[PDB]
Amino acid sequence: MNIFEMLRIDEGLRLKIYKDTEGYYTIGIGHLLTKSPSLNAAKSELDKAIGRNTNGVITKDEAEKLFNQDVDAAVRGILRNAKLKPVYDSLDAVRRAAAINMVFQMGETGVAGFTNSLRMLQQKRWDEAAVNLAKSRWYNQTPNRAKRVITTFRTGTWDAYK
């Protein structure tokens, strides 16, 4: 297991524009296109991201290309964020994949808002952090995915994905 395989399980792969769990236009492996309710706007952003007139449809390869860019951006976002970097650097490799997952889902900002949990993770208080992490809109809205990520921080193993 690794970060790619992990997010590929949590996000799925769809070659035509679809709405995600929040009703926003997305494509591929969880690539958010726009929060706008306009399909045309979505189609606009997709073409711009791909570099061709796609007509709302992309290939497997193109999806994978966006995904790689998205994972890279997520990592870079963490490393550049002053509240996140220290936590991430204190973690082992598995737990770091959990942190990248959360960032890919909710954005750096979002994650940077879990103050209390960030601190517990940094102190290595796993059980305590897992309980605090569950007290969130994130967990109530996508509970099965949240449970998988939380178990990953809790145990430091890939069992929830096995």
Smallest distance, ligand [Kr] to C-beta of residue 151, A: 14
Whichever of 46 and 102 has its CB closer to ligand [Kr], that residue is: 102
Q: Contacts with Cl ion in 37-76 (CB under 5 A)?
A: 49
* 22 in catalytic set: no
* 5 in catalytic set: no
3-state secondary structure the chain: CCHHHHHHHHHCCEEEEEECCCCCEEEECCEEEECCCCHHHHHHHHHHHHCCCCCCECCHHHHHHHHHHHHHHHHHHHHHCCCCHHHHHHCCHHHHHHHHHHHHHHHHHHHHCCHHHHHHHHHCCHHHHHHHHHCCHHHHHCHHHHHHHHHHHHHCCCHHHC
Among 29, 66, 74, 84, binds ligand [Kr] (CB under 6 A): 84
Q: Contacts with ligand [Kr] in 101-130 (CB under 6 A)?
A: 102, 111, 114, 117-118
Residues acting as catalytic residues: 11, 20
